[PDB]
Write a protein that binds this ligand. Structure first.
Ligand SMILES: CC(C)(COP(=O)(O)OP(=O)(O)OC[C@H]1O[C@@H](n2cnc3c(N)ncnc32)[C@H](O)[C@@H]1OP(=O)(O)O)[C@@H](O)C(=O)NCCC(=O)NCCS
Ligand SMILES: CC(C)(COP(=O)(O)OP(=O)(O)OC[C@H]1O[C@@H](n2cnc3c(N)ncnc32)[C@H](O)[C@@H]1OP(=O)(O)O)[C@@H](O)C(=O)NCCC(=O)NCCS
Ligand SMILES: CC(C)(COP(=O)(O)OP(=O)(O)OC[C@H]1O[C@@H](n2cnc3c(N)ncnc32)[C@H](O)[C@@H]1OP(=O)(O)O)[C@@H](O)C(=O)NCCC(=O)NCCS
Ligand SMILES: Cc1ncc(C[n+]2c(CO)sc(CCOP(=O)(O)OP(=O)(O)O)c2C)c(N)n1
Ligand SMILES: Cc1ncc(C[n+]2c(CO)sc(CCOP(=O)(O)OP(=O)(O)O)c2C)c(N)n1
Ligand SMILES: Cc1ncc(C[n+]2c(CO)sc(CCOP(=O)(O)OP(=O)(O)O)c2C)c(N)n1
Ligand SMILES: Nc1ncnc2c1ncn2[C@@H]1O[C@H](COP(=O)(O)OP(=O)(O)O)[C@@H](O)[C@H]1O
Ligand SMILES: Nc1ncnc2c1ncn2[C@@H]1O[C@H](COP(=O)(O)OP(=O)(O)O)[C@@H](O)[C@H]1O
Ligand SMILES: Nc1ncnc2c1ncn2[C@@H]1O[C@H](COP(=O)(O)OP(=O)(O)O)[C@@H](O)[C@H]1O
Ligand SMILES: [Mg+2]
Ligand SMILES: [Mg+2]
Ligand SMILES: [Mg+2]
Lengths: 549, 549, 548
């Protein structure tokens, strides 16, 4: 009995817990996709590997096991570097499997001969070309384990065509056991006590809940910690829903005030990177104190010093914090000048946006449109939200009630992830509704993948919030002077639903919003709802712009 | 008087002969696109940088000056690596300009902070981050010159946002003169004589005309050489049209016989790489002798030894060959057993395909559909042809009469280039019709760019030859078992023309072909013609498959 | 009041805990070495950056803060990549600071213009070119912290000449506080319990003590763990001395038997890499069970599956194991079939080597020479031991009694480290004797650094065990057919002591060993002892070669 390299790879992947594979077939990886389907891995054929490789990283975030992207040699693999870099930037587990030319044609100018390991290297924890067919399971298990152990990240496997198509006797192949979940590392008890003692000295304490806490599956421990301590908290964009967004201790609507004035912040799986304005003035106080909880020791003390470091797994360390609070109870008072100032700011920002939610002017505004989207999203739906103002106002208006239910442009700020992340969510969660809310520019980066969603019967509804460009475009184009970020005015993207026999809707007036969105979400194929908005509409005013520089 | 980095870069690019810029704006490169338009560079806003970066390389091939791709920091630049690699593989001049985060935020986890120089490195002749605003023109001229001097190739410029947005006094900036065309290097006269003498010893000589001869603009000298010597010749796929494809000395229809039996080949700007089966058995004779004309000395003698090396520019060396033939006339006899065998093979392959051109069976075949496309392509049109069998049979059926009028997947075999290369051709040749003939899979890699063609008023007609997948897909999909390379059956891609107000046509029967194609090509917006074909249709049988392994 | 980039860098390095800098000056880094000395960093000018860069990584191992290598632009930096790679291979904290050409000359073909960041990249956790003079302390702190937090490793700082020589106002510069010691992470309680439960099921358990335990400074807890449990243990080559090598539970003289027959091993900061034969047959049992203690989660389960993963700091995790043994006491019985077999192999291997220690044949053998070296080494000396058989037999014959007192070719198997590691050890431990024991080939990789040791008054004695080549060479060279690994027969390397006015000794017969070594170790300048041995002498025979 013999077996091919392709069949060994597919068996090993399934044994290691891979359940989802996204890519595009061609020389030399056709038999890998075929073998993956026979092993029961779900294979999705995309229209571009760029989108497929973003889907793979999203699987890693959602499941804690790497999604796999399968790409042909040369340009196929290079298209997939996009997803390597997005997983690198977000510390998400993901594997790109790239075919390569037959090894005995190296140097000859073989079909799609390319330095693929060197191209992947900057973005991966692990890059390997297996030396022989019979050792393939060694490399598969090592790749999988390296993506999920330590700080999670990306890996690249380089498979020459002759390793894929060649055969060995089955008896020559040893398969490792399934890589177990990594141990959930703990902080020293002295550091646990030091974190809690420091909290008790703060006049204006703040907890930030980030997507590291979501990735760790720490949501029960984090909610218990925040409720026991009574602390104000802020969710990062993909930390939304770790604690339900309607929780009374959320100060999301006073975010700028909270960061500017806190004297002590607890970072629960969140970085002091650009998203948090580096922890630095003018957005933070120059003397802010930091308790930092991260699996990555090297991240501790980036940009601003850390007073108490909690290095390890967020679920395990937050459980240590909760155990120590049970031993030595403490909570932050419910009546303080901090709470009063936070509540004043929340109420003022609520009053500012309320008229915008209720403005029926045409062309419509973001808040008016997102109001009706919000009121029709099931509470356990997964939201894929991508764009500039479409995503930023979507972040504030569309709540999440469960962890890991918002997928957006994330740390790398990537356009091109929307449909791929929606398809990943549908594959992981076949029983949920997926709502994809994209700006019109965002939609165009991967718009062909609406047919992919349709072909695999995925429960995704596509909503486009269209202002004619990248932050808007004019109503009529001057052919001699097309703005660099404009598109065809009133582009009818919803006609793309006719490609696969779905329903497309073109919305311009507020009386259309509720009936159209309700009907669209009920369709047995993915509907596309193309909603025109004013090119003057934008977010509620802020003292500071989001891009600190 | 002061000037920004963005304005300096745009002025320098225009001074160096850059006329075409393709990309997507965003932080930090918005002011570069604006300044490029003010300087009179044509800027095209794409839906994905992947397609834009392929457009830039095509400009390099068509014009001999680099096309420029403009990309934002991080994922924008990484999307554009695709075009770097395609230009690397084809030795085409091309520049990717990537924004980068502000330099004073390095190390902080800045927005879209990424190792962009290291990501570009494997594919570029030149990668630089300018050290200061006032030296920007030094780097622009050095990048341009490096892409077109020597063996042409790709370059990457890394521009931190503060170099783009900062200003200096105009008096601090020196601008180099426009980089002149590189000198057209000559072979030693002894080698010229040796090449011609070797030709006179051959019993079965063959000339191969490749896209290096096209790039060199050598078409007048090459045609004169082939006609003076009376030699049989074969065009490579993008060498088609250097000599008009209806020339009586073409042996294209006997290609396999010609390569298998020639005893001496003249490579005029063509590599012995995978496209030519490495010059090795079983597709070539083991003792074949090679005269090799290439600008790259390092390419000489790859895979098979070269008997006479002609290193330098193809136009200049072919002129040397023609001058020596005028001094010492010679021609290959018109009546030889070689010619008789070539003509026998041509006639047999003509007889094999003639019934296929005339078969009206539905679902239709490739040859029947391509017959009617061929008969409506203007003789000076530019053809963009991409796919597997759509491109390979398009290569044989659709003739080219002028040099540099076919753009296809080229050396890297890339899917994703079709629409971008058509847009590049339209930008370079505003007075010509561009016909883009894509397989259905090929179409989906960059299908959103039909709106880009429409928005800029480009004279492109999109034809899709649709067999439901990558080499075909079934007529009905089993939801539990979707073939990895299949798409939605009878996908109505022509409805994408409704996005921008163009006309879409759905063709299934042969009586539709001529009226539909005629009307589509006459439209003032880009039409999409979606032509269904049998999933059993394929190319005429061959003794060997194209992928030697 | 203004300050240069060079002065900022030196102040930042000192503040971050850097104490030792090794390198060679020239354009553009001259002012950095001067500023370093003014800050009280110890600077050593070497004869080659290659040796200097190995010294920097050894400081990191010995101290837990990176040593720094200072190199000029272009070839200076490239010579120092050797030390980046050695630190990478051993997970030692180390910084290479390379000068670069002036930034405004990039692209021009500037003096020593080179792609230095890309050259360092494969071996470093961190590589940065500071964007501006005022942010230099940001990069220094970030580089230091990255080398010592998590799995320790190397960093590269790329300093253009105009960042070094340029100035800013002092008020423009902010200095981060000294990087605190890294947090010492712990294993889940259920894993601590599972480790101890597994030990109680084992018929033939074994502890392996590696240089990760030494780097962690876990020696007190490791000794307590091994003594409490009564387990047999094996030290890795640089794990020697974490427990004193004369400890009764060491099974070093039964190494192959122990690895072949153990059914459950506790890896205390040691890898299943080539040095442990990948944990695989034929050197290990196919069904061996593994409890693995390592700070690197990604290392867990390499080559063979791990049954209990103890991810975190070795000192902290061993303290966890000790605390649970206090609650639930257990020890391995002192009379078992396993102990009886281990002791039988120990006694047989002892009987095999005893006549080699007492063999007075000339030319001499390794064991007879190393016997007299051993008996003169002070118990708290640092040993630098490098070569092939010189190092491999030195490993078994020369005991260590304290942690971090043996420095050898380590995980990368590097020749070129011996003098640089001895100089590093002298700098870290000015109160100790440093003894450097090298094969003749190893000596030649960095032999000019004996003058560096003399110039800085370091308490180092250089011993060369000389068999005329790489594993030996002939007594007479056929001048037209020189064997690729041979050197001049009876090459008088000890005459190099005359370069700096030291004492060189040439030894051929056993009566000379003891008086020569005693006198040499007492010299006020570094002495060189060049000891000839037979080119037929070799190590004790083994069933298996070390290179699996
Ligand atoms: C960096 C970043 C996290 C900074 O956050 P931000 O945009 O300043 O703030 P938020 O989106 O949380 O909230 C915006 C404003 O609405 C307020 N707000 C939030 N929820 C609210 C609510 N329910 N009611 C009223 N106001 C609310 C906030 O307090 C803030 O106003 P403020 O500055 O006066 O406090 C965020 O801008 C981001 O993720 N940007 C992504 C950029 C990107 O990647 N683009 C695509 C590439
Ligand atoms: C590698 C490559 C150059 C090899 O060429 P090929 O496909 O064998 O040959 P051609 O396309 O020139 O011609 C195909 C056949 O049609 C014949 N032919 C060509 N023109 C003809 C004509 N007008 N009438 C009849 N027959 C004709 C040829 O002689 C050959 O038949 P043969 O093998 O019996 O001689 C070519 O296959 C190629 O470029 N492939 C691209 C693959 C790719 O990149 N795919 C997408 C990724
Ligand atoms: C990989 C490596 C750890 C393998 O260890 P090894 O060489 O097989 O074993 P050791 O050096 O620990 O011991 C060698 C032999 O001496 C024995 N021994 C050790 N101490 C002893 C003592 N005091 N008395 C008697 N015998 C002793 C051992 O049991 C072993 O014999 P065995 O195989 O019969 O058990 C080791 O060879 C190594 O580090 N090599 C470095 C290679 C290099 O970098 N070269 C340059
Ligand atoms: C790969 C890549 N390329 C480009 C960008 C730059 N970029 C933005 C943020 O840097 S965001 C946006 C779309 C906004 O346009 P939109 O979706 O229509 O949303 P809206 O504001 O008009 O509502 C674009 C193109 C990017 N981030 N990533
Ligand atoms: C970037 C990238 N990704 C994938 C491939 C693999 N690949 C092919 C050649 O290796 S070709 C083809 C389309 C054929 O399908 P098609 O267009 O519908 O043409 P047709 O034969 O059915 O007529 C595909 C997907 C590739 N080359 N480059
Ligand atoms: C940088 C580098 N270059 C070469 C080697 C290969 N190499 C050895 C590996 O095992 S070891 C040794 C010397 C043995 O010769 P020696 O010192 O005289 O010792 P001895 O056995 O004769 O007693 C040499 C040269 C190396 N490891 N690193
Ligand atoms: N299991 C885990 N426990 C704790 N931290 C984790 C875990 N997995 C990832 N992380 C950390 O979570 C942090 C998430 O930061 P970031 O992506 O910036 O979050 P956000 O964008 O939500 O602020 C990263 O620094 C990462 O190392
Ligand atoms: N100006 C020039 N003169 C001669 N050769 C050139 C010139 N420019 C590029 N080339 C060479 O032309 C060759 C084209 O080969 P290739 O791309 O394989 O052609 P094809 O695909 O048409 O066979 C390359 O090796 C390249 O170095
Ligand atoms: N503080 C620490 N605690 C635990 N493990 C550590 C620590 N520092 C380094 N390590 C680990 O120690 C291991 C040492 O293995 P190695 O260098 O192979 O040792 P040896 O050569 O002694 O077998 C490395 O895998 C490294 O990740
Ligand atoms: Mg928009
Ligand atoms: Mg097709
Ligand atoms: Mg020797």
């Amino acid at each position: 009995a013999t077996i091919t390299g392709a069949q060994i790879v597919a068996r090993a992947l399934k044994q290691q817990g891979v359940e989802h594979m996204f890519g595009i077939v061609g020389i030399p990886v056709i038999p890998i996709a075929a073998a993956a389907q026979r092993e029961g891995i779900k294979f999705y054929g995309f229209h571009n590997e760029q989108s497929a490789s973003y889907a793979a990283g999203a699987v890693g975030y959602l499941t804690g096991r790497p999604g796999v992207c399968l790409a042909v040699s040369g340009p196929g693999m290079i298209h997939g570097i996009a997803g390597l870099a997005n997983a690198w930037s977000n510390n998400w587990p993901m594997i790109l499997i790239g075919g390569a030319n037959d090894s005995y044609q190296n140097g000859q100018g073989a079909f799609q001969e390319a330095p693929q390991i060197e191209s992947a290297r900057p973005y991966v924890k692990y890059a390997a070309r297996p030396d022989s067919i019979a050792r393939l399971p060694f490399y598969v298990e090592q790749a999988v384990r390296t993506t999920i152990y330590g700080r999670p990240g990306a890996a690249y496997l380089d498979l020459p065509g002759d390793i894929i198509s060649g055969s060995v006797e089955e008896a020559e192949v040893t398969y490792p056991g399934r890589c177990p979940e990594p141990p959930r590392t703990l902080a020293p008890e002295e550091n646990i006590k030091a974190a809690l003692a420091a909290l008790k000295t703060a006049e204006r304490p703040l907890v930030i809940v980030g997507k590291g806490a979501a990735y760790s599956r720490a949501e029960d421990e984090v909610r218990k910690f925040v409720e026991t301590t009574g602390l104000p908290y802020l969710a990062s964009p993909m930390g939304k829903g770790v604690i339900p967004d309607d929780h009374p201790q959320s100060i999301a609507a006073a975010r700028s005030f909270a960061l500017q004035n806190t004297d002590l912040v607890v970072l629960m799986g969140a970085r002091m990177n650009w998203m948090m304005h580096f922890g630095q003035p003018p957005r933070w106080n120059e003397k802010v104190r930091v308790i930092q909880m991260d699996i990555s020791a090297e991240e501790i003390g980036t940009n601003v010093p850390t007073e108490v470091a909690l290095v390890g797994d967020a679920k395990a360390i937050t459980a240590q914090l909760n155990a120590e609070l049970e031993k030595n109870p403490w909570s932050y008072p419910s009546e303080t000048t901090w709470w009063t100032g936070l509540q004043s700011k929340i109420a003022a920002n609520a009053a500012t946006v309320e008229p915008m939610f209720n403005d029926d002017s045409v062309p419509m505004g973001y808040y008016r449109v997102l109001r009706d989207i919000r009121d029709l999203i099931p509470k356990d739906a997964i939201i894929s939200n991508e764009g500039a103002s479409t995503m930023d106002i979507g972040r504030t208006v569309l709540p999440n009630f469960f962890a890991r239910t918002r997928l957006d442009a994330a740390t790398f700020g990537t356009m091109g992830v929307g449909a791929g992340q929606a398809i990943a969510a549908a594959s992981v969660h076949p029983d949920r509704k997926i709502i994809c809310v994209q700006g019109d520019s965002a939609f165009g980066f991967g718009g062909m993948e609406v047919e992919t969603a349709a072909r695999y019967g995925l429960n995704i509804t596509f909503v486009i919030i269209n202002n004619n460009g990248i932050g808007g475009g004019p109503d009529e184009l001057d052919p001699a002077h097309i703005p660099p970020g404009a598109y065809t005015p009133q582009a009818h993207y919803e006609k793309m639903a006719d490609v696969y026999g779905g329903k497309g809707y073109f919305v311009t007036t507020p009386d259309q919003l509720k009936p159209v969105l309700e009907e669209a979400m009920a369709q047995p194929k993915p509907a596309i709802v193309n909603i025109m908005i004013s090119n003057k509409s934008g977010r509620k005013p802020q003292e500071f712009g989001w891009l600190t520089r």
